[model samples]
Target: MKAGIDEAGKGCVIGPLVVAGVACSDEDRLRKLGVKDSKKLSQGRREELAEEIRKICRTEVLKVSPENLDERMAAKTINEILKECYAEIILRLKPEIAYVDSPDVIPERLSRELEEITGLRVVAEHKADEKYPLVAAASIIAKVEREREIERLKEKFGDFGSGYASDPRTREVLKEWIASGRIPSCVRMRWKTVSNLRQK
Candidate 1:
C-alpha cells in the first residue's frame, strides 16, 4: 500500500489542528479521482472528494484541539507534534511507502525521522500534496474535516472568518472575547494573537 499524510488548521489561531492520511493499493484510481492539493479545490469539491476518497482509501485522522495543543506545546515543539502525528497515521495505515508534505525546511531530515519512527520508507517534500495524488487525497480529508469542525464552532460562537490570525473578523472576535475577560476553550490562548490582544 502507498500512503500520504498532511495537515490542516496548523496556521489557524482557532479550531483543532487535524492530521489526516489516506492509503490505497491502486495509485491509478487515486489519480483518476482528480485529486489535487486541497487549497486548489473549492469547498464543495473538497467535501465531495472526501466522501469518495473515504470509500477508495483507508483513512486515519488525529485532531488536536486548542487545549491539547497548548498542553503539548509546553513540552514539545511543533515539529515534534508533527512527527508524532505522522508516525501515528503511518503506523495505523502500515503503508509500504508514505509521502508527506514536509513541515520542516529540511525534507531529507524529516523523511529520515519519519522513516525511523514508523519503520516505513517516507518521502517528505515541499508541495507533496500537489505532487502526489495520495497526499492530495489526504489533504482533502483533512481540509474537509477541519472545515466541518469550524462550521460547528461558528454555530456556537458566531462568525470568525477563516480562523486565521490575519482575518479581521477573527481578530474582532478575539478582541471582544479578550475584553470580556473570558476566553473560550476553542481559542488558542497561547497564540500570539491572544497575547497581542491582551497587551492592547
Candidate 2:
C-alpha cells in the first residue's frame, strides 16, 4: 500500500490534535474522485469525499486530547509529537511508500526525521495535500474527524467555533472561564494564549 500522512487542528486551543494516515495503491482513483487539499474544500464536500475515500483506502489515525497534548508538549514540540504519531500509524499500516504533509520550515527535514524514526522512506513536502492525492485524502480524513469530534465535545462544553485561537467565539469562551479565576480543563497549561488570559 502507498500511504499519505497529515495532521488536522494543530492550531486548535480547545480540542484534540489529529494525525491521520490514508493508504491505498490506487492513486488514479483518488485523483479521479476529485481529492484536493481539504482546506480548500467545503465541510459538506469534505464529508462527502471522506466517505468516497474510505471506499478506496484504508485509514489509521491518532488523536491527542487537550490535556494529553499539553502533557506531551512538556517533553516534545508539537512537530515531534506529530512524528511519533505518524510513525505509529506507519508502523501499523506498513505501506511501501509514504508521503507526509510537513509542518517544518524545511519539508525535507521532516521526511528525513520520519525515516530515522521508522526506517521507512517518507516523502515529506509542504502543501503536499495540494500536490498529492493520497496526502489530500489523508488531510480530508483528519479534518472530518476533527469537525465531528468538535461537534461531539460542543454538547458537553457549549459552542466554540473551530476551537482555534483565531476564532473569536473560542476566545470568548476561554476568556469568560479565565475571568472566573479558572481555566477550562481542556485548556493547555503551558499555552501562552492561556497565560495571557491569566494576565487579563
Candidate 3:
C-alpha cells in the first residue's frame, strides 16, 4: 500500500489548516479516479470527486486552525508537526510507501525526517499533489476538510468569503472587523498577514 499526504489551507489567513492522508493498494486505480491536486479542480468538482475518492481510499485528516496555528508554529516548527502527524498515521497504517507534499524547501529532507520518526520509507515531493494521483487524493481529502471547516467558521463568524489576501471581500471584512475592534477568536492576531491587514 502507498499513502499520499497533502495539506490544505496553508496559505490562507483564515479557516483551519488541514493535513490529509489517503492510501491505495493499487496505484493504477488512483489514476482511474481522475485524482489530481485539489487546486487543479473547481471547488464544485473537487467536492464531487472527493466523495468518490473517499469511497475507495482509507483516509485520515488533521486540522490546525488559525487560533492553534500560531501556538503550534511557535511551539514546534512546521516539519515537527508534519513528522508527528505522518509518523502517527504511518504507524497506524503501515504502508509500503509514503508520499508527502513538502512544506519546506527541501522535500527530501522532510521525507527523511518523517522516515526517521516513523521508520518507514517516505517520499517527499515538490508539488506531490500535481505529480501523483495518490497525493491528489490526499489533496482532495484535505480540501474537503478545509471546506467543512470554513463552513463551520462561517456559521460562527459570518461569511468572510474565500480566506486569502487576494480576495477583496475577505480583505474588506478583515479590515473592517479589526478596525472596529471586533476581531473574532479565530483570527490569528500574531500573524504578520493579520498585522498588515490591520495597517490597511
Candidate 4:
C-alpha cells in the first residue's frame, strides 16, 4: 500500500486548513477513477473522483481550523501540525511508501523534518500532486471536501465568493457582515484579519 498526503486552504485566506491522506493498492485504479491534482481539476470532476477514491482507499481527512491554526503556529513550528497529521496517517496505514507534497520548497529538508518528528521516511516532492497519481487523488479528495464545506458555510451564510485575501468580493462581504454586527458561528473570530476588521 502507498499513502499519499496533501493539504488544502494553505493559500486561502478563509475557511479551515485541511490535510488529507489516502492509501491505495493500485495506481491504475486511481487513474481510471479520474484522479488528478486538485489545482488542475474542476470542482465537479474532483468531487466525482473523490467519491471514487474514498470507496477504494483507506482515507482520512484532518482539518486545522483558523482558530486552532492561529494558536498552533504561535507555539510551534508552522509545519509541525502538518507533520503531526502525516504522522497520524502513517501510523494508521503503515504503508510501504508514503508520498507527500512539500510545504517548503526544499523537499529533502521537509522529509528530514518529518522523519525527525514521525520517525518515518516520507518521500517529499515540490509537486508531488502533479507527479504522483496517489497524491493527486488525495488532493482531489481534499479539495472536493473543502468545496463541500464551503457550500455548507454558504448555505448558512448566503453567497460569499472565494475565501482568499485576493478576492475583493469576499473581503467586502466580510467587512459588511461585520458592520452589521451579526457575526455567525462559521466566522473565525481568532484570525487577526477578522479581529482587525472587527476593530476597524
Q: Pick the candidate with the highest TM-score.
A: 1
TM-score of each: 0.95, 0.93, 0.88, 0.87
Residues 113-200, model 1: lDDT tens digits: 8888878899999978889888888888999999999999999988889999899988898888889998788998777778877999
- Residues 7-63, model 3: lDDT tens digits: 887777787778888897777876787775356677788889988887878888888
Least accurate stretch of 10 residues (summed lDDT) in model 4?
Answer: 33-42
Give model 2's TM-score versus the native structure.
0.93
What's the CA error at residue 134 for candidate 4, in Å? Answer: 0.8
Tens-digit per-residue lDDT, 1-200, candidate 2: 78999899887778788889998878787888888645677888889999999988899889888899898898998878888998998888888889988787698777887888889878898778888888888999999988888878888778877788888888898888888877667677667688787777
Compared with the true structure, all predictions reach lDDT values of 0.88, 0.84, 0.80, 0.78
Question: Better model by TM-score, 2 or 3?
Answer: 2
Give the range of the ten consecutive residues with the poorest summed lDDT in model 1.
32-41
Assess the local accuracy of residue 15 in candidate 4 as a C-alpha lDDT between 0 and 100: 74
Cα lDDT, model 4, residue 17:
76
RMSD of each: 1.3, 1.6, 2.2, 2.3
Q: What is the alpha-carbon lDDT of model 4 when measured against the actual structure?
A: 0.78
Q: Quick one: best lDDT, which candidate?
A: 1
For model 2, the run of ten residues with the poorest summed lDDT: 183-192
The alpha-carbon root-mean-square deviation between model 2 and the true structure, to one decimal in Å, is 1.6
lDDT-based ranking: 1, 2, 3, 4
Which stretches of model 3 miss by more than 4 angstroms?
Answer: 37-40, 78-80, 198-200
lDDT digits (tens) for residues 77-115 of candidate 4: 547777777777767777777899988788887787776
Relative to the unseen true structure, what is the C-alpha lDDT of residue 130 in candidate 4, on a scale of 0 to 100?
A: 85
